[PDB]
Design a protein around this ligand. Sequence first.
Ligand SMILES: [Zn+2]
Lengths: 83, 140, 141, 63, 101, 203, 69, 142
Amino acid sequence: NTVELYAEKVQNRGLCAVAQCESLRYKLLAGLAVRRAAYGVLRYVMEAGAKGCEVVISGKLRAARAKSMKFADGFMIHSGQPA
Amino acid sequence: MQSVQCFGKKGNATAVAHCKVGKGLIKVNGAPLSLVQPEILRMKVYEPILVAGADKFAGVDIRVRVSGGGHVSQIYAIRQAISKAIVAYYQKFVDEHSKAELKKALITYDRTLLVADPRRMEPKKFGGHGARARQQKSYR
Amino acid sequence: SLVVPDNFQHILRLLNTNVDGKVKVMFAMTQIKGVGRRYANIVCKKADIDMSKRAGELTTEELERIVTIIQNPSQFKIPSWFLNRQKDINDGKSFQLLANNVDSKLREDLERLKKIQTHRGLRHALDLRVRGQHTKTTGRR
Amino acid sequence: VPVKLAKVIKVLGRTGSRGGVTQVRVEFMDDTSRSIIRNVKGPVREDDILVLLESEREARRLR
Amino acid sequence: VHRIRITLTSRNVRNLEKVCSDLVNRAKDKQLRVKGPVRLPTKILKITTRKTPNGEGSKTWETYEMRIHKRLIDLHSPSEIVKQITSIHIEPGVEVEVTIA
Amino acid sequence: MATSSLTPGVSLDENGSIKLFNKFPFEGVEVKDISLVDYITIGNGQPLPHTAGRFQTKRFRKARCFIVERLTNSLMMNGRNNGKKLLATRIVKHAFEIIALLTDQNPLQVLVDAVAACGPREDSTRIGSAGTVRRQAVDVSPLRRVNQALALITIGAREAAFRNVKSISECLAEEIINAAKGSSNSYAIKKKDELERVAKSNR
Amino acid sequence: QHATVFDKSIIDRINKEVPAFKFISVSVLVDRMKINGSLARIAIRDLAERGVIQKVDQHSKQAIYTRVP
Amino acid sequence: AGVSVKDVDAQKFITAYAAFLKRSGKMTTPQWIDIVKTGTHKELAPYDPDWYYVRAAAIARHIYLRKQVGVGRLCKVYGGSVNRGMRPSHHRDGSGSVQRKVVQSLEKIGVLEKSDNGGRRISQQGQRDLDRIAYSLLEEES
RNA sequence: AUAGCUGGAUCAGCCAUUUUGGCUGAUCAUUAGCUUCUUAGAGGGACUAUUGGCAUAAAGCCAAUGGAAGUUUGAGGCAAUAACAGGUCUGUGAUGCCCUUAGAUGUUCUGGGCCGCACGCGCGCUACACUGACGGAGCCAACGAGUUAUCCUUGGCCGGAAGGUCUGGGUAAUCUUGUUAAACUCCGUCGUGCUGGGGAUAGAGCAUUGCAAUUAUUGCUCUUCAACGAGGAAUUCCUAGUAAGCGCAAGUCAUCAGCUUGCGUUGAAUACGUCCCUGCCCUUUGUACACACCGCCC
Ligand SMILES: [Zn+2]
């Protein structure tokens, strides 16, 4: 009994990118449309209070020729400490 | 009790001058100004003495505690300490007019006798052995 | 600094080397293959001879003394570790290679290693590098 | 006789292929007139004295 | 007449300053004359590595740094006070040492 | 006066309101030049030329620099000797001593006259663009006179002292002495004469 | 070829013509005479111990010596 | 008055004082003072025949100027660039076999003493000897 | 008092001295008071401020005083959209497809090889000496690293410092370390001759690291001491503490740097420009090109 664990429930769930990434991964595993799933998560985070979100799905989407689809929308910073 | 401390430096080196009441005593690290390690650069450390004058340089005892850098840095630091010891001594215990009389000559002819040189070693970047120069490329 | 009008014999010879006429002692007998820089000084001090004067003025008695110390250093209170060759194969003692004996023993040992067929001997036969030196881009022509 | 001292009064700009020479205008000391256009390789500033041995050339520009 | 020495080693200046403020607050709550927190030099772990996972491309390197800050204190706390202060001033991210030597 | 420290009575002022060289080559007097009074800096004394001032951060700080300092800088060449100012100033001090012994003049005015005479006056610069190889004759600025002369003496001394018993200091002294009074025997003067002659021919 | 040993001729030549040139050093000795250079160093020392020559800036490598006047 | 070894050349002291050390009869130069190179970074052999005397009586000055030194420290002091052939040179330590003997000979003379929590120090006898000889060379002139 | 400065108890010796001592200092939790040199949290400090200049007299620059700074104050880190059939399936218990599996392309063990040379090409070190090489002496830094089974190591012992034995410090601004480094400086020797410059190549043996070193581990005591007697067509990097030379630390480590990543000492020549070569950005323009001039076509 030198170590004990406390299971906290949540502190917000629409701004943590890991949770949204897992949700997107599970929907893709289910087999929904890539665009529809990428939308669904982007509307979810935007309602949660996101200023700008970018979702990039890369790989073999429909055929052998793999490609990358990006659905960036909002304000995004590609810089130092702000980014 | 006439005692005052001064500091001087030339980058990676530093020197402390413990100016005190007395006469002569311009020794550096226990050794006088006449026995600096570079024999060819002894006149540079003697320069602050002769720029003002031995007549006005009397009445102080300057002991230097140089450390750091190279030989050129060490002689630069001790000359900086011996040049600022007289100014501070004549600022603290002699009239400011005489202090300015020393200072005007000490600034008219000086190799940055009280202004620290801001030049520093540039960091080295990957891809070459120097800060700015990169290694050659075969091109074929 | 010394007496100039002395007698000289210019060119002198000792131990398979025509030593030059008027050179200092160490530069004189360093021409002989087998002696060393520290070897020159130690034998000069041990033979009770000067070093500043040129080797031409050396007399017969000192030449005989230098021959004796060169031939038999062991008998004159010198440990065998100084000599390059020690505990030889045939006899089992230590000596020094100064005369044609160095080439004679080199050829004889080369024949011996050819007989025993070592890798170093095979490399010597093929005129390659005995030690681990890369021959990929060096040793040309 | 052939030693001429000229003083530059203005600079014009860099000419030539690499800009290695510059076109300038010079004026002599004993003569105020006769402004001569010349081409000089190295950097040149004011209050300079140019020693010349051949002056009756009137070079226009360097290609 | 017991003497203490807290290592106060941490990786964040803000958290170290907060716990140091709490420690000195508990110190001046009892007036043990203490000693001013001596800030030992920030020891830095610096390494360099190649960006690419293979040998192809331009030779680019990344330099990573980690900063560690350390403090110290001196006390004269008895057993009851030292056990109370240790139970009170426990804070995350900071290692505390206790000696009486 | 005298203190506890010896302070030998050799390094006194002995200046006459100047700073002088290392208590032998002297300074002050008039020196002067014909057309480099604005580009050759001989004012206050420099007891030793080993000064670490910044003279390259601007364009003309090199122009506002001591001629002996630039000579040391142009002598610290042959990269196996790069970055040795102590060796450069030792050679220069030796060169000044032999110059003062060989010629009556102090080793400052002779150097000023040497660089003044050694500097090229007309140069045949390449037109450019390749193929044309036409080239044209142009003038030389006083700053180019200083750097060209200093370079010519340094390479001349280095090449002529590269392999011979004569030392670098003696070779530089002989080169400067010959280059002073237009001897047409020094390497620097010979090169400048050839440059002027080819510029005249190409004109 | 530079001479290796003095032969009663170089010694009198240097003793007579050492004030002929203003600058005295190893290089000028090898130039005027045919001295090897080690003898030039020893001749400079043997002429400086007396009043025949005058030291100016002798140190390090170069031996700077001059005629008495 | 104003005299100390802090401003005096001690190298010239050894050459004149070699006779006095012989009079004392405590130098006891080892038998190998003619063959050893006094360091691996060295190339052929020492040139001056008084090298052992000069090194000993100058290490004494080194110990005077220093607080306390050891054999390994002195070996690092008496090093230099070592010609490694075609490979670029580096720094290599001196010869401990000669440094230890040099220091031990100094202790037998009396100028040196073993310091507490340190390798070796300089005795008052060595301090006074060095100061007296420094005074002689500093006062002899004029 | 995990660092120095000074006094205090605290002892060593003279040139002078019993007011005439300076100076060098040994020990130091035996003791006290300060952080200016060390430490870093908060801090002040640059805005080209100011008079003088120029530009449709608004967006900047030039020289100068003050200052540590005026090139964005130097140097980096992060760095848009679109694209490459660019590299990596051998970094990945990351992966689709294919192949393979008991007589195994799975796993393990021994040895060899990866280093093998009539040659070609690159990144690099050493030199081609007099500014030299060698020998006696003095000594001037920064970035870092180190043990609970087992690292960084101090002090003591005999001798071929290659090394070994004993005892103690450090899990660390305290021990290493004050990294007393090299280059460097004084004197002396070799005196220009592929010479005691350059040490490639080879012969013999002496210890350390390691199952163990043979195809020499590595260093070491000796001997031989070669091409190099300052490099063509061509080509590379570089604008200020920069180039260049010199050394140090670390990564890979049982041992091994001629490599890389960083640091420090000494420390420059030349420019303050141009599109001339080689590329890049913008506008106009022409096109029979659109995997787009390494095009298309006759
Ligand atoms: Zn891997």
